[PDB]
């Protein structure tokens, strides 16, 4: 296909389950609003995501993610996601 | 599930049942103040005004040391400082000088207009992405006299209530 | 079996290792200097938070590390990562915030920690015990958060506000 990269891993996060991919941008969100508005360990809906920087995408395309969807979208650059989790 | 409380913000003597739920600023605003005849000429009942943890300011409500148990509320000893506190201060003002009393009213004014400013937003700052079934999202307000480390998520069907100015100036400083 | 308990968290900055604890006070400091003077990058970093403790009027707040805190036995420690939390979403909204939205919370955060440098600062004095301890009313603050101090710690900053207590008397 036309297989996306991972550049980099700015941040993490313990985010509502589901607040992750294209409707986390800062763009998007600006737009639409934040899919994890005010969420906390109240509820689950409940994981781990990673804030991801792309090859060839500015900062403001950046978007959370998770290993599930990650791995779905078979996102090359895999290496650096094992090696961010140490 | 049991609520706390975080502060105690001020006292008063007011109607016998002007108590939770009804007396949050919002509350009165939509159907009116529980208390709102009251001045002398009716009995009064000592209440204290409260600011629960985990809830900002606009959700402070009036209580009584019986309905706070009744609600079996956490931080129960706050309320017995505060009551130790304030005999001091009353006492703390045995003569004292008109000086002193006028230095007192003075302080103790510009306090109370402090303090309800933190009921006031000052401005919004994101919005989220579901609605309720009225189609409110909710806001993530920052309130006047408060750092953001403050600033709460809210229903938007109550801030829309009185501060439907800041949601359209929300809106409007990005298209 | 003494326990200190977290009030709230007022501050958080990044600080040369050690400069936290007693010698982090407002009074610490001017009486013997600040342990954080002119830090740079130039040595270890690390990220201090000042609190303001329960029982103790805000010129005792001192500047601490998740680590002093947990060493000490400190209580209130679970504020810490609603706090951690709530600055890293602060600090993470601010990364894309818009130039108009920045500046507006640049200045209020001023305005914010204009008001926090008052609560240390006596507005008044309103009764010594039988150097005596002084009943202080604090500057911005209520009458309910006056407290009693030190006679021989508030005098060495505060002489004038006993003097226009005791020509009063």
């Avoid at chain 1, 990673?50 to 979208?73: A, D, R, V």
């Avoid at chain 2, 700052?125 to 006047?144: E, F, L, V």
């Avoid at chain 2, 953001?148 to 100015?165: M, N, P, R, T, V």
């Amino acid at each position: 296909e036309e297989f996306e990269t991972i550049e980099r891993f700015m941040d993490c996060r313990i985010g509502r389950k589901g607040a992750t991919g294209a409707t986390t941008t800062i763009y998007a969100v600006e737009a639409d609003g934040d899919p994890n508005a005010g969420f906390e360990k109240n509820k689950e809906p409940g994981e781990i995501q990673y804030l991801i920087k792309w090859k060839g995408w500015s900062h403001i395309h950046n978007t959370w993610e998770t290993e599930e969807t990650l791995k779905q979208q078979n996102v090359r650059g895999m290496k650096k996601l094992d090696n961010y989790k140490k | 599930e049991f609520e706390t409380i975080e502060r105690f913000m001020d006292c008063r003597i007011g109607r016998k049942g002007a108590t939770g739920a009804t007396t949050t600023i919002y509350a009165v605003e939509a159907d009116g103040d529980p208390n709102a005849g009251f001045e002398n000429k009716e009995p009064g009942e000592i209440q204290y005004l409260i600011k629960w943890k985990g809830w900002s300011h606009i959700h402070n409500t009036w209580e009584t040391e019986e309905t706070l148990k009744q609600q079996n509320v956490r931080g129960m000893k706050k309320l017995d400082n505060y009551k130790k506190k304030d005999q001091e201060t009353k006492r703390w003002l045995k003569n004292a000088s008109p000086e002193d009393v006028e230095y007192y009213n003075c302080q103790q004014e510009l306090t109370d207009d402090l303090h309800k400013q933190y009921q006031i937003v000052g401005r919004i700052i994101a919005h989220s992405n579901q609605k309720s079934a009225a189609g409110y999202p909710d806001y993530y307000c920052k309130w006047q006299g408060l750092p953001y480390s403050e600033c709460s998520w809210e229903d938007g069907a109550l801030i829309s209530k009185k501060f439907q100015a800041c949601i359209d100036e929300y809106f409007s400083r990005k298209k």
